[PDB]
Amino acid sequence: DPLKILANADTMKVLGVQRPLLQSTIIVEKTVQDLMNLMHDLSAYSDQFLNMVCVKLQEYKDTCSTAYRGIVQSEEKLVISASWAKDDDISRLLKSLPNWTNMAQPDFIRAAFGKESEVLIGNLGDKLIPPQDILRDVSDLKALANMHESLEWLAGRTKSAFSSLSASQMLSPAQESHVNMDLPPVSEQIMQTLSELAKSFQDMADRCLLVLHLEVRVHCFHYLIPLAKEGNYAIVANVESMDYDPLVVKLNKDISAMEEAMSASLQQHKFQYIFEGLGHLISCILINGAQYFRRISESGIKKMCRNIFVLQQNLTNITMSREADLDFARQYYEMLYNTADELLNLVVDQGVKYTELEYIHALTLLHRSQTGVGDQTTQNTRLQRLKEIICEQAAIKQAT
């Protein structure tokens, strides 16, 4: 219930908010408001009215926590995104990156994408994600999205209440050693309880947004990691067709459905935080995933390029900018059109662009797939010469 009924469109215009707010949040904030109004009139019972504010806010906090766990627990444990957000080290890293820190302000952020991708690839780049570890229903994602906006709003309202009380009774450090104790209209303990409820509503709001940000990314791994181990990219096709992976089609539908919900539930800069960076992550997934192919054929490369194109069109349309990292992943797979020897010539002619391991894994993939090399002794020799070509390129560049 408390994360379903949204406030009517005329309540938003009153409060001056341009995004859906939960009716339950509106109700508890109205009750706090009424309590705050009575403490100015019946100032003699200010403590009692304040204790009722804290209790009702604590009740709504507990009510939201319960609703959260119901969305986020699966088989008596957290889904991956929830597990990562709850984790201190991971949440600390994510909250320290410019895409979060500068979320509201209108390539440093592209380097922050590299850090998210590194953590995600490092821990998920070789894992099969079972269905019970992700959130499929957009209903749950939408519930998370306007729990975020609602609790962030409630945190702002609760913070204003605290600061109004604080400002009326604030003393300077020089005025402490003075005679007149007066009477603090509110005890420090009601103030501390109240300011912590405000922080708690913000922490809960931040968590929901983190979960949404990570959830789309985990979905990318769920659908794209099976891509490599399909045994479907080694087919020899003398004629070309518009065959591309159903998993990629499912990912696109998944991303689009989520894009639909977030746009109506979140402020734009929260929306952009969810969907920007997916291009970088997906390209990393596809480049890193090539090392799991047993065989690759020319038709398979054509199919992966269609996969990348389909994903590119969708993300470009969602983020309103071309995901250039997807071009980088396309160019990587186009390297596999070459022969094992031509691939080495490409590195000599145009320099080192991918990591050493990415080049080594490309050549090794070609050896497992192609036939224009022969015995293992010439393969080991070509592999060792590729490393020397990379060694030389580095030493040359560091000297100039």
Author numbering: 557 to 662, 674 to 967
What's written in the study?
The exocyst is an octameric protein complex tethering secretory vesicles to the plasma membrane prior to membrane fusion. Previous studies showed that the localization of PSD-95 and SAP102 to neuronal synapses is mediated by the exocyst complex; they together regulate the sorting and trafficking of N-methyl-D-aspartate receptors (NMDARs) from the endoplasmic reticulum (ER) and the Golgi apparatus to the synapse. The complex also plays important roles in cell migration, synaptogenesis, and neurite outgrowth.
We determined a crystal structure for the C-terminal region of Rattus norvegicus Sec8 (aa556–975), which will be called Sec8c hereafter. The crystal belongs to space group I 422 (a = b = 190.004 Å, c = 175.275 Å), with two molecules in the asymmetric unit. One molecule contains aa557–661 and 674–967 of Sec8, and the other contains aa556–662, 675–732, 754–802, 808–936 and 944–967. In the structure, we found that the ITTV motif is attached to an enormously long α-helix. The spacer is sandwiched between the PDZ-binding site and the rest of Sec8. The spacer is slightly shorter in the crystal structure, which was due to the lack of visible electron densities from residue K968 to the C-terminus. Overall, Sec8 is the only exocyst subunit that contains a rigid long spacer that bridges the PDZ-binding ITTV motif to the helical core structure. The results showed no detectable interaction of Sec8c with either PDZ1 or PDZ3, whereas Sec8c bound PDZ2 roubustly, with a Kd of approximately 4 µM.
